[PDB]
Design goal:
The structure is a homodimer of 269-residue chains. With 269 residues, chain A is an alpha/beta fold. In chain A, 28% of the residues lie in helices and 23% in strands. Chain A is built from six helices and twelve strands. Chain A binds chain B through residues 37-39, 225-229, 255-256, 259-260, 263-264, 267-269, and chain B through 37-40, 225-229, 255-256, 259-260, 263-264, 267, 269. The structure holds 2-acetamido-2-deoxy-beta-D-glucopyranose (2 copies), lauric acid (DAO) and 4-nitrobenzaldehyde. Chains A, B: InterPro entries: AB_hydrolase_fold, AB_hydrolase_lip/est, Fungal_lipase-type, Mono/diacylglycerol_lipase_N.
Chain lengths: 269, 269
């Protein structure tokens, strides 16, 4: 069980994460209203929310996403898109670690996530910094679904502690690195990570523990079914690095559960 | 705005209509349980419901669907799939009428749906007749989404009057013929047709009335949004051939609205 305000926040950033796929966007001028097809992001459309900067297939990892300004909620939101086809992305997912002492000593992260981020970090940091300067009062939020969720988690860990808090809301994110990287994520000040999972979603169960991955704590776990609407009672806060009894349970996982966080996500009607 | 009992039927056959796309049965032998992927048909799975005959790309229209036995609800269900890529099917959709006197006098129907039905009619009639014999007190229901709705409607008009009632539940069905056919489907005895539409779904708006097409009355119009759950209070019975102020409004239409009838339909998570 979670509060009404936190629920609202979860719902909202699920929608900012969905909008990265379903935005009628990119090649889209900054200052343009954010809108989505197929009722993917109505809470974003109600807000006075506009693109600050769009990126598409940027750097080494072909990164895609947007930076947004939201005058109603007082946010600067960096939203990273997951893969265009999650099924093949999961299939070709490689489990190699690389060191990232730059982020925390002793830390190793998934190699493709950290290198995709690393390769666009300098541009996007500057874009965020610019927006922070313009709106010092506004709250900085990074978010994403799936691989997008990963990238937002990495960028957060990397960019925190430079003066402004960075909250992270992740939906169906994979593990992003080794224990230690997990531990850092569980305690790092300068922002909070809300790591949201749904039922038996496959993606947060990869990379597997066996390959040297852990999940940060806590975990926000939606227990309502696929295509079922979520209420506050359906969300369970689960404490403990690599805790079991939320998404991390011993049963057959599901791709469709990956695509239903509050609403349709990771696909566009 | 509709009865609970009617809302429950509408929901059940939306799910049988969704199963024609989802829940693997590709060669599933007769008598196996009906199930779907992606929580597309839970009310069906909850019933004691089994396949009688599966068909696929059958006849000239590459018609696909199944016939089921439902012992819990006491039904014999013939469910037609719509198109495997609806956006395309929408783009390739010819508006030509053809005479269909055999069904009714002065009646013209859409050439492709009519022909497609006619090519499978004998084999499917025989399979329904068999089940009707083994279960004389079960209700015969034909149902379908999109193209599947057109077909079910045509098949119903074509096989009624043989001694067993056939009810038809269509979802997001296009127009199937001319005003004289609309009339025949409005008043025909030996069953009821329940023609359900959602919001500004585009498909029930095609073929255009400006190509000689008309809609049978009544229409059951779902006013709740895309990705929004439906209650009995969100459905409005609209009376009159080519009535306006349900789905048939001059506003701009939408494809995602076509894929949300009670739940997700015409696509599988
Ligand atoms: C963008 O949204 C703003 C505030 O929410 C609204 O006043 C404006 O009409 C919208 N702009 C366009 C171009 O639709
Ligand atoms: C088929 O469903 C029936 C009841 O609806 C159930 O008794 C039976 O076990 C199911 N068969 C399988 C293989 O699950
Ligand atoms: C009654 C079942 C009819 C379903 C089969 C139609 C074939 C769908 C293939 C996709 C081509 C198209 O876009 O129309
Ligand atoms: O509607 C609510 C609401 C609550 C909190 C937040 N937020 O902190 O961004 C946004 C929306």
């Amino acid at each position: 069980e979670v509060s009404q305000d936190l629920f609202n926040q979860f719902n909202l950033f699920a929608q900012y994460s969905a909008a990265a796929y379903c935005g009628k966007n990119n090649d889209a001028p900054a200052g343009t209203n954010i809108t989505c097809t197929g009722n993917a992001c109505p809470e974003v459309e109600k807000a006075d929310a506009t693109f600050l900067y769009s990126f598409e297939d940027s750097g080494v990892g072909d990164v895609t996403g947007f930076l947004a300004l939201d005058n109603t909620n007082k946010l600067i939101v960096l939203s990273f898109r997951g893969s265009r086809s999650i099924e093949n992305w999961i299939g070709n997912l490689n489990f190699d670690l690389k060191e990232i002492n730059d982020i925390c000593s002793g830390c190793r992260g998934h190699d493709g996530f950290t290198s995709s981020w690393r390769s666009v970090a300098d541009t996007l940091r500057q874009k965020v910094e610019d927006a922070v300067r313009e709106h010092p009062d506004y709250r900085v939020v990074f978010t994403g679904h799936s691989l997008g969720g990963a990238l937002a988690t990495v960028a957060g860990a990397d960019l925190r502690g430079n003066g402004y808090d960075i909250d992270v809301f992740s939906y169906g994110a994979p593990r992003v690195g080794n224990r230690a990287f997990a531990e850092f994520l569980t305690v790092q000040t300068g922002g909070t990570l809300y790591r949201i999972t749904h039922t038996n979603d496959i993606v947060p169960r990869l990379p597997p523990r066996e390959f040297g991955y852990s999940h940060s704590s806590p975990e926000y776990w939606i227990k309502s079914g696929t295509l079922v609407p979520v209420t506050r009672n359906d969300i369970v806060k689960i404490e403990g690095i690599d805790a079991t009894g939320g998404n991390n349970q011993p049963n057959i996982p599901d791709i469709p559960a990956h695509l239903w966080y509050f609403g349709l996500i990771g696909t566009c009607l």
